[PDB]
Every structure is written in structure tokens, then in C-alpha cells.
Amino acid sequence: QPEPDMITIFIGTWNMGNAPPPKKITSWFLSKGQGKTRDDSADYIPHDIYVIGTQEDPLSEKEWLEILKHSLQEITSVTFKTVAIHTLWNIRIVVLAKPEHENRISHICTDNVKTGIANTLGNKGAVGVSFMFNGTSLGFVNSHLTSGSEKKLRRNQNYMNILRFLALGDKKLSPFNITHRFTHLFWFGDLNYRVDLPTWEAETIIQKIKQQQYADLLSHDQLLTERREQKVFLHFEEEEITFAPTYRFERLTRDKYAYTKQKATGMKYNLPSWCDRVLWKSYPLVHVVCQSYGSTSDIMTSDHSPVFATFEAGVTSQFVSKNGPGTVDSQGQIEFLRCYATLKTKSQTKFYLEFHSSCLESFVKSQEGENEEGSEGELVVKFGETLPKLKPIISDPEYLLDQHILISIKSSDSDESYGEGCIALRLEATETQLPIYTPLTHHGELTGHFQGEIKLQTSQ
Ligand SMILES: C[C@H]1CN(S(C)(=O)=O)CC[C@H]1N
Numbered sequence: 001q002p003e004p005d006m007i008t009i010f011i012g013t014w015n016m017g018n019a020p021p022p023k024k025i026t027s028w029f030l031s032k033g034q035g036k037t038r039d040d041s042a043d044y045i046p047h048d049i050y051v052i053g054t055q056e057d058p059l060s061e062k063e064w065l066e067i068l069k070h071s072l073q074e075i076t077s078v079t080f081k082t083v084a085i086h087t088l089w090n091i092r093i094v095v096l097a098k099p100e101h102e103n104r105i106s107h108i109c110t111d112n113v114k115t116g117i118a119n120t121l122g123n124k125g126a127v128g129v130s131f132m133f134n135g136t137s138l139g140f141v142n143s144h145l146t147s148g149s150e151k152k153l154r155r156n157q158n159y160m161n162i163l164r165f166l167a168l169g170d171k172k173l174s175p176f177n178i179t180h181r182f183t184h185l186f187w188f189g190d191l192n193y194r195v196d197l198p199t200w201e202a203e204t205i206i207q208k209i210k211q212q213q214y215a216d217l218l219s220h221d222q223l224l225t226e227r228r229e230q231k232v233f234l235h236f237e238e239e240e241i242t243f244a245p246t247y248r249f250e251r252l253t254r255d256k257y258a259y260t261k262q263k264a265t266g267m268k269y270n271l272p273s274w275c276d277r278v279l280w281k282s283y284p285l286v287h288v289v290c291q292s293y294g295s296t297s298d299i300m301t302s303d304h305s306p307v308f309a310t311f312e313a314g315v316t317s318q319f320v321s322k323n324g325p326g327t328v329d330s331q332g333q334i335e336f337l338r339c340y341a342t343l344k345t346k347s348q349t350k351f352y353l354e355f356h357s358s359c360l361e362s363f364v365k366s367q368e369g370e371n372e373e374g375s376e377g378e379l380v381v382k383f384g385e386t387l388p389k390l391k392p393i394i395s396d397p398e399y400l401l402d403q404h405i406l407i408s409i410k411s412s413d414s415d416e417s418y419g420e421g422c423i424a425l426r427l428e429a430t431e432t433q434l435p436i437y438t439p440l441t442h443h444g445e446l447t448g449h450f451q452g453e454i455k456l457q458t459s460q
Pocket of ligand 1: 224227228229
């Protein structure tokens with residue numbers, strides 16, 4: 001039985017509105033309804049992994065697990081294995097996988113983050129799951145962010161708290177937050193970003209939705225506009241939205257948006273909005289293709305419609321050679337030429353680099369770089385030709401070209417990371433000087449750049 005080089009992953013997000021689901025929810029898992037939907041000819045083909053995010057979930061874990069497994073069994077005739085389930089208040093994540101994957105999946109981690117302080121601590125936050133699938137690290141975040149049209153800044157703050165404090169993936173990757181720890185990171189939930197149009201335009205918005213004319217609505221979607229101004233979800237992707245706003249519906253129909261202010265809403269309008277979203281971030285030059293992104297039309301127990309997204313994701317095998325793992329392979333090396341970091345920091349301390357990768361036996365610390373002034377104020381940290389020669393555990397190009405090097409630039413004074421980025425070894429050539437580049441971030445915000453040249457030697 002050969003190891004896969006591709007798997008398909010189903011991501012679902014549903015705010016259930018504290019109501020039990022209807023007896024049939026198979027349309028969700030089949031990516032049927034509005035938007036980018038899945039071909040009928042694929043209906044019996046199981047996804048490799050199903051990741052289900054719920055918000056305002058009134059069910060026990062046991063109750064929801066039985067509905068999800070019986071749903072997938074009716075679709076596929078496959079009895080899925082429970083990889084992980086984690087609940088914070090009414091925010092839940094379930095990960096199910098095909099039984100054939102049980103011994104491909106390891107290093108399962110779960111965590112949660114509670115967002116806000118006092119007033120604002122008690123029901124919003126995030127749950128997450130990570131694991132290895134063969135040689136590929138996968139992370140999944142289900143977040144329920146702050147509600148209300150006038151709280152997009154709060155949502156952006158909730159995002160930064162979640163990516164700073166959610167403890168998933170390889171704890172040895174100590175300078176790196178969840179936005180650098182995974183081959184593929186999927187972040188989804190009731191993110192609660194709204195279509196920011198005047199309240200007096202509610203009926204105009206509804207008109208536009210009935211005409212399936214989303215263009216003038218999406219131009220005011222707070223997640224797209226905040227992303228465009230680099231306020232949130234920097235270096236994440238989202239598929240184009242071609243489905244109607246998923247909030248706020250009258251229950252038991254999809255014929256009516258319930259937008260008017262009510263005691264029950266705290267006297268807030270809920271203009272139709274794309275609250276319910278799926279985004280991802282994969283390492284540079286790894287295959288990831290969105291194959292569906294849409295909403296169901298036939299699940300109406302909640303004031304939200306379920307959202308589905310499906311992805312092709314590149315995966316690698318658990319590589320064994322005669323040499324590594326458990327030693328180096330003298331035939332492999334990674335060299336760096338003409339390298340420099342450009343940092344936004346106003347501070348003047350010395351900096352060194354750390355290189356982290358599962359292709360190394362352990363992380364490597366460089367010598368301090370030489371600080372110079374950029375022509376536009378910037379701090380430029382020059383490494384020239386001084387960076388170490390990295391010794392990968394396996395030299396086979398079929399392994400080494402699929403790997404990545406995480407970089408942290410750390411202060412010599414404090415040993416705190418000022419920026420994190422990632423470099424793909426999927427080079428156009430080996431034994432050849434090639435440009436490399438990554439942006440650097442810290443707490444998910446842009447803090448600088450790293451650029452230079454790489455020279456990769458493999459056993460070929
Ligand atoms: C960075 C993405 C998404 N953005 S966006 C919606 O402005 O943030 C446009 C260009 C794309 N490469």
C-alpha cells in the first residue's frame with residue numbers, strides 16, 4: 001500500500017445558534033448549496049480528513065460525534081475514526097479521518113484560548129487541533145470572535161491573542177507561533193466580520209443578495225478590507241466568496257434575513273454578513289488547492305448557514321535512509337550567501353539568526369550579524385557569507401527539496417525573536433546560488449524581511 005502525496009481535507013464551520021441540528025446535514029459534508037460546490041460525481045468519495053468547527057453548539061461531544069459519524073457513514077459507508085475533539089464553552093472542533101490513516105496520524109495536540117478581559121471574558125475564543133500526517137504537519141483553528149459591526153478592531157485583537165497563545169504543534173519551535181508551525185494551517189469559524197454599509201441600506205443589501213450581486217457587498221466586507229490594509233490575517237488566503245451572506249437568517253427558512261435591532265440583539269442591527277469563513281496558510285511552494293467554498297441552503301435550525309471548504313493538500317512520507325534519521329548525511333548541505341535582514345525595529349541591539357527544521361537534528365544558532373543604517377531609516381542586519389552551513393539528516397533530493405527552513409532573528413541582549421519567516425527548499429536547481437526571500441513577522445505583524453541567496457547540495 002503506497003503512501004499518499006496528496007490528501008483532501010474538508011473544513012466545516014457552523015454557528016448552530018444554540019439549537020439542535022436537523023435530522024439530515026449531509027449537504028454540508030457534500031459541499032452542496034451556494035458558492036463553489038463539489039461535483040455530484042464525487043459524492044461517494046470520502047475526504048481523507050474532516051475538520052468540523054462549531055460555535056453556539058448546544059450538544060454534548062457525545063451527541064455531536066454520533067451525528068457526525070452517522071452522517072459520514074450514510075454518505076460514504078466509511079466508519080471514520082475520531083482523531084481529536086476539543087470544546088471551549090460552546091466552541092468545538094472535531095477531527096475525523098479515514099480508518100486507513102489511523103497509523104499515519106501522530107503527535108495530536110489540542111488547545112484553546114479565551115479572548116477578552118472581565119466584561120469580555122466568558123464566551124468568545126478559539127479551539128484548535130494539530131497533528132502529523134506522515135511527514136506533514138497540519139493545524140486547525142476554530143474561532144468565535146467578538147460580535148457586532150462596530151467591533152472589527154476587537155476581532156483583530158482576538159485574532160492576535162489566539163495566534164500568540166494557542167499552543168499547538170512542535171513545542172521545540174519556541175520562537176514560532178501557530179502561523180509558522182505547520183505545513184498547512186486552516187483557520188475558520190464565526191469570525192464575525194460584517195458588511196459595513198449604512199443601516200438605512202438594509203433593504204438595498206437584501207435586494208442585491210436576491211440578484212446574486214455580491215460585488216458591491218464584498219467591497220465593504222470588514223474581513224476583506226481589514227486584510228487589504230494588513231490589519232489581520234496577514235499571509236493567509238481565502239477563496240473568492242460566491243455564496244450569499246450566511247448571517248443573520250430567520251430560523252426554519254432561508255427566505256428572510258433578520259437584520260432589525262431587537263432587545264435580544266442589544267439594540268444592534270445585524271446587516272447580512274459573511275460572518276462564517278475559512279482561511280488557510282501553507283508553507284511556500286506546497287500544493288494547496290481550494291476545491292469548494294460555499295454554504296448549505298437546506299440546514300435552517302440556526303440563524304447562520306453552515307459553510308464548507310475543501311482542499312487538496314500536498315503531503316510527504318516519513319522518510320528513512322541508511323543514514324538519517326539518527327545521524328547526518330555528509331552528502332547534504334544548505335549554504336547561505338549575501339544574506340541580510342531588514343527590520344522595522346527602532347531599537348539598536350545585536351541580532352543573531354536561528355534556523356529550525358525537521359530536516360536538522362536540532363536548531364542552529366548563527367553568529368551576530370553586522371548592523372548598518374538603511375537609506376530610508378531601516379535597521380539592516382548583514383550576515384554576508386557568515387551564516388553556518390546546515391547539515392540535513394537526509395541528502396536524498398526526493399526528501400530534501402520538500403523541506404522548509406524556519407528563520408527567527410533574535411536580539412543578543414534578550415534572546416526574544418524580532419521576526420519569524422520561512423524558506424522553501426523546493427529550488428529550481430541544486431549546487432546553484434539562487435535568490436531566497438521571506439517576510440518576517442512577530443505576533444503575526446510584519447516586522448521586516450530576510451533575503452539573500454541559497455546553495456543546496458543533495459545526493460544528486
Ligand atoms: C494577499 C492576498 C489577499 N489580498 S487582500 C483581500 O487585499 O488582503 C489581495 C492579494 C492577495 N495576494
